[PDB]
């Protein structure tokens, strides 16, 4: 007796900052908006997207370690390999808007994405 997760909506902009730690070109050539949509889809969708359009991916995936309580996936490319971690699985909508919020803080991009949709 228990709901799945809870859904979100962001508005990828990417006249806001690319990085500078992000690749400014694949940071115009990625979806405009993720949502609406599931929490934890979203969130990881802005961060796996951010990991792959990473400058120097290799320290980038540093700013996220492998969590392992079984949430959500995030690949990348390191050394020529391909690399997954594992994230925490969320339940709540604030959640989703927070936890790329802590990794785009360490990557000092802002203004890539806006939750506050346009109703």
Do not use: W
Request: glycine share 8%; charged share 15%; with cysteine.
């Amino acid at each position: 007796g228990s709901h799945m997760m809870s859904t979100v909506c962001v508005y990828v902009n990417k006249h806001g900052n690319f990085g500078p730690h992000l690749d400014p070109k694949r940071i115009q050539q990625l979806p405009d908006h993720f949502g609406p949509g599931p929490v934890n889809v979203v969130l990881r969708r802005i961060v796996q997207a951010c990991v792959d359009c990473a400058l120097e991916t290799k320290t980038v995936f540093g700013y996220l370690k492998p969590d392992n309580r079984g949430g959500e996936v995030i690949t990348a490319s390191f050394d020529g390999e391909t690399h997954s971690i594992q994230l925490p699985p969320v339940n709540s909508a604030s959640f989703a808007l927070r936890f790329l919020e802590n990794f785009c803080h360490s990557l000092q991009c802002d203004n890539l994405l806006s939750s506050q949709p346009f109703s």
